[PDB]
Amino acid sequence: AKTMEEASKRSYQFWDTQPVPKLGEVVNTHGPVEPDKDNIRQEPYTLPQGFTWDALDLGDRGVLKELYTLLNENYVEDDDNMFRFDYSPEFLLWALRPPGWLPQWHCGVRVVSSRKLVGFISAIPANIHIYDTEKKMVEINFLCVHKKLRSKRVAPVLIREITRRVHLEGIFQAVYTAGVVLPKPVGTCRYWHRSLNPRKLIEVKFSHLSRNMTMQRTMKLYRLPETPKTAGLRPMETKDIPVVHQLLTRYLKQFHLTPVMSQEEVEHWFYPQENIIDTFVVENANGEVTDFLSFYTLPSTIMKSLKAAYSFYNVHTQTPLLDLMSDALVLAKMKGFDVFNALDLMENKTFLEKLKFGIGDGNLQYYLYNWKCPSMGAEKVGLVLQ
C-alpha cells in the first residue's frame, strides 16, 4: 500500500505485533510504547530451513562486493521498474560505517550450503531530536531480500533480529523510512526532481516531453548558468568542520525531527568524497562561513547509467536559500549529474517550484519504532536518510 487510503483497508500481520501506534490512531502523547528491556533474547531468531545469519565485515572487500551485488540486483526500484539504485562500494562504506558503527548491525542472511548472500538489513547509531526529547536511536536501512526469496516472510525475521541486536546494545528506539504505508507514519514527504540534462532524461524514459513542447524548448527552460552566482562559494575543507557543525546544529532547531550530530559525525557526513558526497560552503568577504549546501551521489542503472544528485542538508544564514539552491543545481550540472532530487521537507517547498522542480510519483514515509508522538507536516521533518 502506497497511499493512506489503501492502508485504511489492510490489516498488518507483523506490525500489529510491534510497538508502533495504530494506523487509525491519532496521537497526542510523547514517549515509548513499551519499557526498555532488562532481559534480552540471547539466541538469534530462527530462519527458514537452509538459511543462516552472518554479520558482514565491510572492511573485507569481497564481502562488500557481495553486499552491493545483492543490493544492485534486489533493492529499491522505481515503481515503473525502469531504474534501480546502483550503490557503489565506497557509497556503502559512507552510509554504513559512520562513527559508532557495529559489525553485528550489518546483518546478513546466507544460504547455508553455498553461503550465497540472500538478505540484509542494517542499523547505524544516531542521536535523534524528536519534539522536546533527545534519544539515542538507530537508523535502519537497506532491508533487502533476494528476489527469488521474496514473499516468503523473511522480512519480519530480519526486522526482529536487527531489533534484538540493537536491544543487546541498550538502544530501544529506531527511525526508518519507506515508500509504503505502515503503522504509523510520523511524517510523509514527496520526492521532486529537477532536470539537468533533459535530452538524456527523456531518451532513457526518466521523463517525457511535456504537452506541446519541443526538445529545443525543454532544454531552454532547464538551461543553467555555467558558474554559481553566490560570492565566496567553495568546497568544504577540514578547517570548515567546526563551523559547519555549528551552522547545522542551530539551523536544525526549528524542525521537529532532526539528527543531533557530533563534530566527528559532521566530518563523516559532510566532508567531500568524490562521487559520494559534495559539500560547498559560503565564505564571505569577512572570511566568515555563513551558509552551506550539500548533495550526495546515487546513480541508477537503466534496467548507460542515470547520474542523480540528492539534496542533503542546506543551511542558510546570510545567503537566501533560493540562491543557495540555484548554485547547488549549477554545481551538480557542472559535475555531470543528469537530475537533482529533493524532498519537500525542511524549507524546501519555498524553492521547489521556483527552481522548476517537478513533483514525483512516490511518497517517502518516515517512521519511529517504539516512540509514540504526534505526526508532523513535511516542513517540520529535518532528517535526511540515504
Binding site: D78, D79, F83, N141
Partner: peptide, 7 residues
Amino acid sequence: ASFSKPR
C-alpha cells in the same frame, strides 16, 4: 528509501 521519477 524510495525511487521516484517525474509524474
